[PDB]
């Protein structure tokens, strides 16, 4: 997250870190057994880390649970990032508590102009590299479909939305991929892509979770 703030330990209790020997992507806990992340975060050998604040210090509220299954969307296209969504099943259910909690799936799609909370352990520099240890947060508004398509001509599908600031300076970034975009208390987006981070005229692009709720529900009813 570039241009964000330190969230505060465990104030984003649905945020997970995906670890394969090191943090490599975020995700969102949607119930005690399942995490939503980006398909482009797929790796074999994922351990889900819940209850994290500093990902390099064991502070006492973590739960580390291996994935038993990962399910990339059936129509994910890694070239365009259309349908950039994945489900990860935990080998054992998380113990839900004040620091480890699920986020609701949406019923309706979010509205342009809605301010959403985006979080992660990704790079904090637009130019260069610095990865934080503690979880960072950003409030960013959803941009109109027409502004998103103007920013990335020929690249935005109906399964993507843009959020952020066209002047630059505030965005998600590498290492935040797969993590949450929460708007009005529902998981509306997944950190997916963008040109650089926090560059002028190049807002973040996010997987539109409200298009996937029936897939998510049928898949979790069956696995
Ligand atoms: Ca920790």
UniProtKB/Swiss-Prot annotation:
Regulation: Is inhibited by scorpion cyclotide trypsin inhibitor TopI1.
Matching SUPFAM superfamilies: Trypsin-like serine proteases
Biological source species: Bos taurus (Bovine)
Gene: PRSS1
Tissues with expression: Synthesized in the acinar cells of the pancreas.
EC number(s) recorded for this UniProt protein: 3.4.21.4
Disulfide bonds: 7-137, 25-41, 109-210, 116-183, 148-162, 173-197
One example of a Gene Ontology biological process annotation: digestion
Post-translational modification: Subsequent cleavage after Lys-125 leads to alpha-trypsin. Further cleavage after Lys-170 yields pseudotrypsin. A cleavage may also occur after Arg-99. Not sulfated on tyrosine residue(s).
Textual note on the cofactor: Binds 1 Ca(2+) ion per subunit.
GO MF annotation, one: metal ion binding
Family in the record: Belongs to the peptidase S1 family.
Superkingdom of origin organism: Eukaryota
Reactions listed under catalytic activity: Preferential cleavage: Arg-|-Xaa, Lys-|-Xaa
Enzyme class: hydrolase
Protein name, per record: Serine protease 1
Keyword terms of this UniProt record: Calcium, Digestion, Disulfide bond, Hydrolase, Metal-binding, Protease, Secreted, Serine protease, Signal, Zymogen
Subunit description: Interacts with SERPINA1.
GO cellular component terms attached to this protein's record: extracellular space; serine protease inhibitor complex
Residues of the active site: 40 (charge relay system), 84 (charge relay system), 177 (charge relay system)
Residue sites binding Ca(2+) per the record: 52, 54, 57, 62
Gene3D superfamilies in the cross-refs: Trypsin-like serine proteases
Subcellular location as annotated: Secreted, Extracellular space
Residue span(s) of domain Peptidase S1: 1-221
Biological classification of the source: Eukaryota, Metazoa, Chordata, Craniata, Vertebrata
Binding site for substrate: 171-172, 174-175, 177
A Pfam match: Trypsin
Needed co-factor(s): Ca(2+)
């Amino acid at each position: 997250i570039v241009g964000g703030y330190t969230c505060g330990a465990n104030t984003v209790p649905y945020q997970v870190s995906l670890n394969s020997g090191y943090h490599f992507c975020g995700g969102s806990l949607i119930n005690s057994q399942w995490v939503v992340s980006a398909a482009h975060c797929y790796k074999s050998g994922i351990q889900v880390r819940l209850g994290e604040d500093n990902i390099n210090v064991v502070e006492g509220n973590e739960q580390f649970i291996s994935a038993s299954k990962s399910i990339v969307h059936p129509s994910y296209n890694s070239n365009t990032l259309n349908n950039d969504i994945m489900l990860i099943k935990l080998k054992s259910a998380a113990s839900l508590n004040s620091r480890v909690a699920s986020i609701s799936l949406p019923t309706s799609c979010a509205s342009a102009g809605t301010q959403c909370l985006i979080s992660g352990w990704g790079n904090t520099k637009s130019s260069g590299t610095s990865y934080p240890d503690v979880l960072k947060c950003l409030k960013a508004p959803i941009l109109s479909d027409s502004s998103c398509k103007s920013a990335y001509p020929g690249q935005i599908t109906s399964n993507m939305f843009c959020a952020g600031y066209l002047e630059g300076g505030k965005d998600s970034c590498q290492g935040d991929s797969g993590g949450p975009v929460v708007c009005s208390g529902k998981l509306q987006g997944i950190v997916s892509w963008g040109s650089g981070c926090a560059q002028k005229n190049k807002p973040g692009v996010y997987t539109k979770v409200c298009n996937y709720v029936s897939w998510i529900k049928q898949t979790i009813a069956s696995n």
